[PDB]
Scaffold this active site. Structure first.
Site, short mmCIF file in Angstrom:
data_model
loop_
_atom_site.label_atom_id
_atom_site.label_comp_id
_atom_site.label_asym_id
_atom_site.label_seq_id
_atom_site.Cartn_x
_atom_site.Cartn_y
_atom_site.Cartn_z
N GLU A 171 0.83 -1.24 0.00
CA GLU A 171 0.00 0.00 0.00
C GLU A 171 0.86 1.28 0.00
OE1 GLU A 171 -2.62 -0.54 3.39
OE2 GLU A 171 -4.11 -1.64 2.19
N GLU A 338 -6.70 -8.19 -0.66
CA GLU A 338 -7.13 -8.40 0.74
C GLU A 338 -8.65 -8.28 0.72
OE1 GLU A 338 -5.06 -5.70 3.30
OE2 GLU A 338 -3.15 -5.94 2.25
O1 LIG Z 1 -8.61 1.80 7.33
C1 LIG Z 1 -7.50 2.66 6.94
C2 LIG Z 1 -6.46 1.78 6.23
O2 LIG Z 1 -5.95 0.93 7.25
C3 LIG Z 1 -4.80 0.15 6.89
O3 LIG Z 1 -4.40 -0.54 8.10
C4 LIG Z 1 -3.54 0.00 9.06
C5 LIG Z 1 -3.53 -0.59 10.35
C6 LIG Z 1 -2.65 -0.16 11.35
C7 LIG Z 1 -1.77 0.91 11.13
O4 LIG Z 1 -0.90 1.31 12.15
C8 LIG Z 1 -1.78 1.51 9.86
C9 LIG Z 1 -2.63 1.03 8.83
C10 LIG Z 1 -5.19 -0.79 5.75
O5 LIG Z 1 -4.07 -1.58 5.27
C11 LIG Z 1 -5.85 0.02 4.58
O6 LIG Z 1 -6.31 -0.85 3.58
C12 LIG Z 1 -7.00 0.92 5.10
O7 LIG Z 1 -7.48 1.76 4.04
#
Ligand SMILES: OC[C@H]1O[C@@H](Oc2ccc(O)cc2)[C@H](O)[C@@H](O)[C@@H]1O
Ligand SMILES: OC[C@H]1O[C@@H](Oc2ccc(O)cc2)[C@H](O)[C@@H](O)[C@@H]1O
Ligand SMILES: [Ca+2]
Lengths: 706, 703
Positions: A171, A338
């Site tokens: 990402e 995912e």
């Molecule tokens: O929900 C916000 C984002 O959250 C992301 O997850 C995270 C979870 C924990 C973090 O510290 C940073 C990111 C996902 O990978 C992403 O797909 C999503 O858009």
């Protein structure tokens, strides 16, 4: 002409499950893989965490010598023994709720200050956030690749190993976005300065476009702070173009390094953007990949779908996301890298009976493959959990390999997919409506987003009134796309950039949601579309400016439109619908010349017209509506019916969603009930009615032969 | 002990339905009223819009002379003929998606500029937003009251008319909340100056508290812009206090005018704060009425509950709101002035099967009366709607009085309420946990809110790290209160302001969510509570400053606490729970002399202690946690069990919520399934039942 995965020259529905070997007792790896295979899945997917395997600087363990769950090599061998293909994701970033987002503690402690992403004051944004093109970061990333990539290369499909695909990093830009701040590292600012010099050549040419008075390129600084002048807007617009080249340079450097190991498998990347169960910001994030997707036809992007629940509150998010991915990546299947299984957050429940409906809705909404994330729960070993000891809840298997409620839902869905995939993958929906995707309206992640700390863009200070983020979120994503799906009118999305006219002429209607600005190329394309026979619906503005907010009246002149902008009541009448609530006091008031007036302000001034231009049709509405009242659905319905577009079915309950997918052999009718009501209804094909009862938040699928 | 409405000297569950006569064909007024009565409702509620009845300046129509739906007299007569009591709400503001929020167009055209709410530059904030204390606004309001109040007076129950209650205006301060903009009208700022002079007496006294450098009160300007200095924080804090007095002055002027007409019925107000289906901001809105609630025992505040859906995503919102209202209004029943029926927004669905569960959960959560808002849909006359033609969707009745799906749900719930009200209204829950409500943490509607786009409060610029809004939303509302409700532990909330020590001694534990600042009165109260025998749980900080951020270490010194603030990993261990994720790198590291260490940083520094102080017990945690992991529920459960507090039932499925309500004779067990799963479970006191998704079951036990 559907795009789908192929195995052995036949359509193949990619069914993967995410299983983190590093968070499972290795004595139980085989049981997890067996139980995943027994659901009909063909692939398993995992991160290979850099921190887990480079246990100290230049001390590597892939064999379980220092911890049994460091035995990557055994996990690869078990995938092959249990007849699963494998997706590997070695980072360097993995996120995955792993401490430091997957980067070694020893690395973050050793890196110099200039390796980190920095705010405009020169302060570290976050102690685990590196600058992607940091020389020090890439040196250590390469030393990690030197150890993990030979293992990946050895176990590729072409050498009879199980490895079919690999994700590059994770990402890209997700941290910039969630941190709420952009990277002002001096590596970044210097590459930006080179980009500007390459783009403009002379300070005089830059000054002519920006309306600035710089004596030399040395006077130009990276834009910071709020936008107050059109010159600040121009500087930030180029800064957005620069970050798209920057992320393309990052992925290019990883790809070039990977290919040097003899790795010829499919390369992937994964798109972030869902938060709190909706995806209205995902289009902004996919826009940050515009330059990667143009330069790398061999990297397949997939979606990261996190719906959390399945109701009318978020029913439109997954379809609009699948359509926008198709628009930016039309030569590859639409797939979810995912695909929510269970929940990352204990307090945010994921019900099997919700996700089962999401899975079926995803098929209706054109998904061609997915990776259930997470199929298997994990336990973090050795304190490596970012946020607690347990990784995911309400999954298909618990960490011990016990079946949980979601297991039977995934088996049910997979069974239907395996029975039907040969026809289902080849089916299309008959879209007579095309919606334009104008990428520059999405280029605001540095200045305007749901997550940015500081709101830097205020269009009213620039003498504008149509905000591009308000337009693309409320008028397009939550408005037009939500309204068409609710009304059961099929639509396609097309990227307007370098768009072939012949890829627009197959539609009965093209819908363009326009701000006051639009580049000359797109103004010319839409002009030719109508002159040549196209039917164009355009609102809430005829644009009069280009992407740098300089004069460009190409479309206005080609359409023979005269208008003035006047304030009035929010309410207008349109096509005989009274009290249509519109977003703005300001409206475009059109001269009635060679046109039929079809919308009126409270002073009965003309704020929408229809006209014939060359062989085509133009409908312009000088006001903004999304979907915040019943009158908005009546208006979208009236506009669609102008070209006699019909739904595929007559359905007696207007709150039932359906999709008809068909090829020459087979017709699939998907019924989706996004509402907490048991619904009994009847339906028939638009050209004796069947009765159907559907549970709350549930689905039905009917197959017809011929 | 319980507070409840009464009828014929017996407990009465107030069941009202909102029916807007001015939005309904008068040929159908009787049919709407008959269908409302037939659900078991006893009361009907409506606005009386000023714009609708004063059609031009000094031209009033209450008899349908100019439009049949202006016949207010006939609608009042029909309520009486159909055996319904009536709640009237004549404004002057009604909101209700009515153009100009109910003010007449002719009034807004005619008012001078100085009658409007102004920004700091003296520009009109909005063409329909008046200054509440404008002389010109109050004059015209009084002329409206002079016409509508004699009608209301004549139709009181006292005079065998139907009118039993009246609302004053509507959601006072709601426009300052939604905009984040304060009124800088020079008449308001002159009242602020008077408030400051009254409070501090001399410029020397204000300078000593604020650390300002003024030579006189003439130098003093109303605060505006971002808070950069501790002196800006002080000025904004007193500006919040001022607005609470300002709203009390406004409602007092209306109340005294109303009482002059011989109107002796119950007076009400209504509390906003739900948005997008959760209510974590509503405590901030409750806090704006602090001075009204202190000075008017006879004005009953009710809640505006807008859940939108019913699930684990928002299950905690209505209980936390009902508990905070009881804390601030202990002598009146907790009731919903606007109790969601259908949806204000076509695109935001309100399902009958969701709202039915909400209505039953509301009973579990202590509600004593409600007004279904909207029972009847409306059609806006002659474009008088701010939005489209239609007012609400998925109601009990459409505007034509067609029954919709919600009708049968409301009739069902009302049948249960009428059957049980005599006993149910006299039941309470047995709370052994008390949670402190510290109002100053909530006084931020002008500087920090979910609605305010640009944050004016940045505590790091003040040398602080615990933001009071983050604390009260994530650590308290969505953390501790959500966690206690999920774990099925009863709690009560107590207003710490002027709080009686004897009220706190009934509880086995008092939980205080503390920032770095806390006034001397509250630090002294908590000191006395522990020394006298109380068990205090205090986190994430021992406070060391007062509300003006001046040194105040009374609680710290009285408890023999020493600490250094140090940076560490977000994860700690506590009571042998590993990997507890905490909000801040900065934590309090405690000297453990005479103490037991019970929480540790990743490097084993002491970030929590227990201690005996006098006859009582102290548990201090130098870290912040809410509810964002299973470890957080484990930690709350361990903290509750330190003083041997037990849930009332063993229920085999931990994801079933229950509430036991009892009196001497009767017990009700409310089982609530907030999950998309059919659940089967058994229960016993500290037997096998199936509950549908998003559904409920109520069991009666005689004692
Ligand atoms: O929900 C916000 C984002 O959250 C992301 O997850 C995270 C979870 C924990 C973090 O510290 C940073 C990111 C996902 O990978 C992403 O797909 C999503 O858009
Ligand atoms: O949803 C935010 C608020 O919305 C309010 O309605 C309004 C909506 C828009 C507006 O400009 C003014 C008021 C409700 O009365 C209130 O209870 C609620 O908390
Ligand atoms: Ca001590």
């Amino acid at each position: 002409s559907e795009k789908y995965f192929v195995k052995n020259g036949q359509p193949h529905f990619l069914i993967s499950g995410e299983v983190h070997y590093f968070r499972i007792n290795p004595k139980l790896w085989r049981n997890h893989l067996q139980l995943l295979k027994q659901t009909g899945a063909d692939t398993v997917s995992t991160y290979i965490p850099w921190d887990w395997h480079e246990i100290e600087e230049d001390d590597f363990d892939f064999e379980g010598k220092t911890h049994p769950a460091r035995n990557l090599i055994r996990f690869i061998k078990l995938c092959k023994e249990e007849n699963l293909d494998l997706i590997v994701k070695p980072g360097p970033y993995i996120l995955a709720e792993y401490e430091n987002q997957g980067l070694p503690s020893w690395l973050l402690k050793k890196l110099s200050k200039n390796a980190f992403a920095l705010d405009e004051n020169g302060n570290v944004i976050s102690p685990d956030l590196v600058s992607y093109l940091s020389d020090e970061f890439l040196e250590y990333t390469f030393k990690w690749y030197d150890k993990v990539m030979p293992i990946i290369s050895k176990h590729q499909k072409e050498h009879y190993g199980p490895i079919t695909m690999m994700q590059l990093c994770n990402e890209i830009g997700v941290f910039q976005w969630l941190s709420g701040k952009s990277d002002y590292n001096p590596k970044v600012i210097n590459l930006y300065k080179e980009f500007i010099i390459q783009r403009y050549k002379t300070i005089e040419k830059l000054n002519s476009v920006y309306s600035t008075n710089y004596n030399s390129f040395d006077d130009l600084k990276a834009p910071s702070g709020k936008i107050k002048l059109r010159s600040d807007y121009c500087a930030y617009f180029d800064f957005h173009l620069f970050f798209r080249e920057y992320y393309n340079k990052y992925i290019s450097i990883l790809k070039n390094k990977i290919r040097s190991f003899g790795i010829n498998i499919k390369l992937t990347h994964n798109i972030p953007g869902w938060i709190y169960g909706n995806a209205s910001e995902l289009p902004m994030l996919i826009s940050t990949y515009s330059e990667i997707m143009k330069n790398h036809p061999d990297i397949i992007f997939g979606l990261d779908h996190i719906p959390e629940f399945v109701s009318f509150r978020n029913a439109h998010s997954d379809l609009a996301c699948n359509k926008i991915l198709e628009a930016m990546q039309p030569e590859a299947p639409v797939w979810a890298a995912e695909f929510q299984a269970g929940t990352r957050e204990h307090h945010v429940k994921a019900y099997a009976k919700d996700l089962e409906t999401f899975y079926i809705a995803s098929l209706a909404h054109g998904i061609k493959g997915f990776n259930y994330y997470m199929f298997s729960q994990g336990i973090n070993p050795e304190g490596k959990g970012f946020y607690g000891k347990t990784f995911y809840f309400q999954t298909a298997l618990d960490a011990a390999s016990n079946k949980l409620a979601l297991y039977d839902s995934i088996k049910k869905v997979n069974r239907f997919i395996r029975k039907e995939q040969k026809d289902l993958l080849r089916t299309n929906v008959n879209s007579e409506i095309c919606v334009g995707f104008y990428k520059p309206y999405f280029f605001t992640e540095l200045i305007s987003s749901q997550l940015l700390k500081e709101k830097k863009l205020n269009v009213e200070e620039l003498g504008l009134y149509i905000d591009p983020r308000f337009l693309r979120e409320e008028i397009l994503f939550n408005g037009l796309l939500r309204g068409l799906q609710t009304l059961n009118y099929n639509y396609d999305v097309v990227d307007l950039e370098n768009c072939d006219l012949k890829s627009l002429t197959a539609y009965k209607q093209l819908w363009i949601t326009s701000a006051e600005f639009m580049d000359a190329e797109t103004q010319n394309l839409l002009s030719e579309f109508v002159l040549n026979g196209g039917n164009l619906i355009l609102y809430p503005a005829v644009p009069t400016l280009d992407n740098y907010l300089n004069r460009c009246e190409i479309l206005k002149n080609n359409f023979g439109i005269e208008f003035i902008t006047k304030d009035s009541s929010h309410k207008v009448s349109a096509f005989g619908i009274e009290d249509v609530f519109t977003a703005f006091s300001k409206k475009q008031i059109y001269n009635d010349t060679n046109s039929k007036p079809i919308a009126f302000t409270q002073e009965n001034e003309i704020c929408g017209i229809r006209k014939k231009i060359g062989k085509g049709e133009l409908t312009i509405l000088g006001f903004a509506f999304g979907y915040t009242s019943d009158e908005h659905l009546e208006l979208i319905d009236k506009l669609v019916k102008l070209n006699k577009i019909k739904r595929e079915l007559f359905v007696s309950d207007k709150d039932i969603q359906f999709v008809v997918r068909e090829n020459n052999k087979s017709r699939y009718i998907f019924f989706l009930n996004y509402h907490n009501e048991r619904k009994t209804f009847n339906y028939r094909k638009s050209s004796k009615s069947e009765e159907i009862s559907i549970a709350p938040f549930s689905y039905k699928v009917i197959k017809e032969n011929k």
